[PDB]
Amino acid sequence: STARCSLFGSDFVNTFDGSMYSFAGYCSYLLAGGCQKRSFSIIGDFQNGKRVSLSVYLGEFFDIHLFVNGTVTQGDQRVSMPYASKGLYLETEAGYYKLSGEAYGFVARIDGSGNFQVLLSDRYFNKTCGLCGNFNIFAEDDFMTQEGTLTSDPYDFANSWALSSGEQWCERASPPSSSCLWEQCQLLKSTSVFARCHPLVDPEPFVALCEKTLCECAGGLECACPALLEYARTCAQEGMVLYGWTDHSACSPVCPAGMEYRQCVSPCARTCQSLHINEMCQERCVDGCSCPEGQLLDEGLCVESTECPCVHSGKRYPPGTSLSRDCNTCICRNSQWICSNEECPGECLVTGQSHFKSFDNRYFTFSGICQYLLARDCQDHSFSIVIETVQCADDRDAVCTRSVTVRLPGLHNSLVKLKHGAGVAMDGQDVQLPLLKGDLRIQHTVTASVRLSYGEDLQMDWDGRGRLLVKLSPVYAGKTCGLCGNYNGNQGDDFLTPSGLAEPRVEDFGNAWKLHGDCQDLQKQHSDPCALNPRMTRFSEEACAVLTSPTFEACHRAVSPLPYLRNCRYDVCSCSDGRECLCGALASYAAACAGRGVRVAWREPGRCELNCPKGQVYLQCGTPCNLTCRSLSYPDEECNEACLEGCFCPPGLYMDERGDCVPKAQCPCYYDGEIFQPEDIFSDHHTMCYCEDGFMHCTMCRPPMVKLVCPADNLRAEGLECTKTCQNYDLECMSMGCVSGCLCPPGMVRHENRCVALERCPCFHQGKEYAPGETVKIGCNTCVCRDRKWNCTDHVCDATCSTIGMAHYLTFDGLKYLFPGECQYVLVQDYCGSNPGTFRILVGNKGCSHPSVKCKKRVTILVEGGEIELFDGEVNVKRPMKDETHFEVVESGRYIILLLGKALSVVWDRHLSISVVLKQTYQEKVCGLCGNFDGIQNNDLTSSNLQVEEDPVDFGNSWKVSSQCADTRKVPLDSSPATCHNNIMKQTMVDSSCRILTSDVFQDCNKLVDPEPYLDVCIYDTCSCESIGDCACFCDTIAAYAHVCAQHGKVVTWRTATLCPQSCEERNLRENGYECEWRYNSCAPACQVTCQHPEPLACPVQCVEGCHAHCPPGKILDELLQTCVDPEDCP
């Protein structure tokens, strides 16, 4: 139940108990709020006697103003409409500005006419003490003045609740001294439609209100409409709702547009862009506007059902607009963004100090000093790009790439070596660019950057300092080994190694691709070079921040700047010269943007001016086809290039051999691989040519293993420069000419120092070596080391969607992202498409924009039967599900493990951590905030409208269960969130405290599951949380990481007496003294057979920390009394 008080009419009031009167004040009087423990207060602002604005104050800190013309303020600043915040979801319900606070309990509406409203909860029975009268069934005692004296004059009682504020003084409001046939409202007691209500609230007070209005009622046929509408609303709230009224004489309650004032319009209000979530429309009917019928409510006005625009990247799109992604394209069907399914060309950017972007985008930093295999065909060896990395800037965390050694085997056996400084060394001797061959076309670019180009499949962009940009066509598809990983479009597996197993650590994966056996394997890959050079932190942050500024806002939606921001920070803190490396990082992000399709200037005086040579000009977005006298000499070769942003020359000019461009029609006449000056006639025995313009117009020691050095024929044999070790036997070793050293017998590889047979050499996993025939367990799969290669058993294991922290999620395929949501979102769901759905898990929360101490997650599990809502700290089942057979509520440890079906095994932390575990059955059939469980991480941001979104914010906003609540604003901030950014003191302590994840206790597990996602989740969600007393915000993240570790059989006992202590004393506390049975076990077992659950169950998680009773062998545990007793004393 709930009461209702409305400041309807013109200066009228209706208390919570029915008493009504007139009062035109000016001092923003207190409508409702307890007088003992206020904790919040609805204030009805008044202007010159008119009802202007309805304010709500929470405690003494949060101020919200609603106004009657739709504008909103926080007290000193304006805000947009949906404006979800700490409670107080201010929305538009049915054309009326609704302000809903449920944690406290009330709902404030302001319809077009300006009639306020309030729906206080029963828990304020006899407790509210505002201007709307105390909420007691007795309606005659609703003039309780703030002084505590019950008066009879309404104006005295009303003025006793005035609330002045600073400039807004006030005085005793007094009734206007104005005195006085439209008898229309007499029908309140005559017409049948109203007559039905007579058993309910009587009309006589409303007839008196008529007479009072009618006395003046300045206007025409309006003296009655306010009272009639108020009576109808009061009757509807009291029970039955007057159907059919407003068809006789009412003023047609105003609506913004699409005039459809309709009694009992469901607030669910299926709108234009909604997920069609049925069964959540349980909210009671409320009188309000609506769309005519066939129309559907769009963002603003009503539009036709067949006109719903598609939404992508947080903007609207008329049907059929069909914008194009990188290489695929979408069509914008009826809000479905049907998209193509081609394969785009890959790229393996290697820019920066040590930064890689695998073909399947897997931004990572390795920083190893050796020769590493970047990309290779493997399936059909046709190119073996290899990089040689060497430390720069006399700092450990600075490992540039010095050269590249492409090994195109098609052209006999070429060894094109893109040297430092943009030189090329085809098979030893340097070569004068441009160069042509069978298909090789290495040549300069507009910028000083060699561009190797094989037969329209390879395309490199070496640039000297180091920028390799290997680009492959879809032909190579999923056949490409090397540091760029298989080019199969899935970013998850791009950490594979020659042994055939993905390395969880970047270091192991990188070391796997060594060529020289003597190079040092990389240890922990430091993430913060700034720590070694503190003087650079300020400049690094303040300079790389530009990547997250309006200058790059256009590209922000196309390419997420986070990896590029991290790379810029690392380079600036690590590079030898801050200026050049900063410009390189910014140019890298800009180039990524431009290649995606968006061009950003980002180049300003001082910052990164290109400073083109005299005679050249910058002209961002220039054309490269022309701008070479050679181009004139060969005017029918090709032109299929685009904007390059290089240093071109003024129109009408032409690059010459020397480099200048003053030549316009005085150009060399490149011909037969020779240079001819202008007008250089020439006549051989079978032709005669003259060079005009630019075109050459023409007519007519240690036994027992054998020792060999090399044949020394042309320095081809493999000397000691590369000795085939089983760790690198498969890899293509570099060829630096014969060194004339030792070598193992041809039919067996080297190992350590003793040469051993190839079939007998251990594989590797996490650095550790495993001898042939051994085996290792990965998840629910086991692998055996054979021929230095892992043979794994393929059983797709259960995927675990999670919501680490409050703003971070972990998809089934493994993607982790940030989404600070407030509304109710679809965590998991199988109502994706043609497949008939079976369940929907919604993870709606409250006050969780910024992860806060009071944030709480409300999970509603709409299984086939009905809601299984989880809230607070216990499970509620507000529906008997159709098949209660498959339903358990095992609450081992601190968790509420559920088994809602054969596969669905939701695991709950009794707090803000929720895990959904699915089996092979729900593969590629699920959708929501946790991807689709297809094994591909890239396609896990697919929005509700079946399009991939770069920014996780838009993708999350696409999954809100409602469609009017609010959309999380795309915050451009970076690491060090708001409460973390400008604190330093809090930033540092948070960073240090959220480092236990890398402590010794977690050290054993860190090598099995990287903590960086959880490090971020802890640095975030801990600065955001103002943990006071309740220290769960920080502790919960660590506990979640420990739980993940335990899932991998790496139990960690990290809790202490001073670090997130967890006690169990209260359980053992019993009338019999002390039981000593309930103790905290860091891991504990899974669901334990108990009196209420004698039979065993297949729990999703084998181990779960928390309290548990270590009962002796007999007398298994009970449930109600939380004590273990003989099996007899239970059912």
Ligand SMILES: *[C@@H]1O[C@H](CO)[C@@H](O[C@@H]2O[C@H](CO)[C@@H](O[C@@H]3O[C@H](CO)[C@@H](O)[C@H](O)[C@@H]3O)[C@H](O)[C@H]2NC(C)=O)[C@H](O)[C@H]1NC(C)=O
């Ligand atoms: C809905 O009603 C509210 C309440 O009247 C309107 O707020 C008022 O908006 C006007 C528009 O500019 C404000 O005028 C400006 O005030 C500032 C500060 O006093 C002054 O420096 C300017 O020169 C200008 O006069 C006015 O202050 C403001 N009153 C408030 C906030 O109490 C609101 O504009 C209305 N909605 C719409 C859409 O108009």
Ligand SMILES: *[C@@H]1O[C@H](CO)[C@@H](O)[C@H](O)[C@H]1NC(C)=O
């Ligand atoms: C209102 O409060 C007073 C004192 O707390 C109490 O005596 C009285 O019974 C209350 N009224 C109702 C209806 O509970």
Ligand SMILES: *[C@@H]1O[C@H](CO)[C@@H](O)[C@H](O)[C@H]1NC(C)=O
């Ligand atoms: C170069 O190409 C541009 C674009 O097609 C064209 O306008 C121009 O005439 C060409 N020649 C020169 C010398 O710029």
Ligand SMILES: *[C@@H]1O[C@H](CO)[C@@H](O)[C@H](O)[C@H]1NC(C)=O
């Ligand atoms: C896996 O083992 C089976 C049985 O020994 C064998 O037939 C199969 O070839 C093995 N797979 C690989 C990739 O070696």
Ligand SMILES: *[C@@H]1O[C@H](CO)[C@@H](O)[C@H](O)[C@H]1NC(C)=O
């Ligand atoms: C937790 O329980 C398991 C199995 O019951 C046991 O092996 C382990 O020693 C326990 N740990 C502690 C700290 O009691």
Ligand SMILES: [Ca+2]
């Ligand atoms: Ca009362």
Ligand SMILES: [Ca+2]
């Ligand atoms: Ca891949």
Ligand SMILES: [Ca+2]
């Ligand atoms: Ca997927």
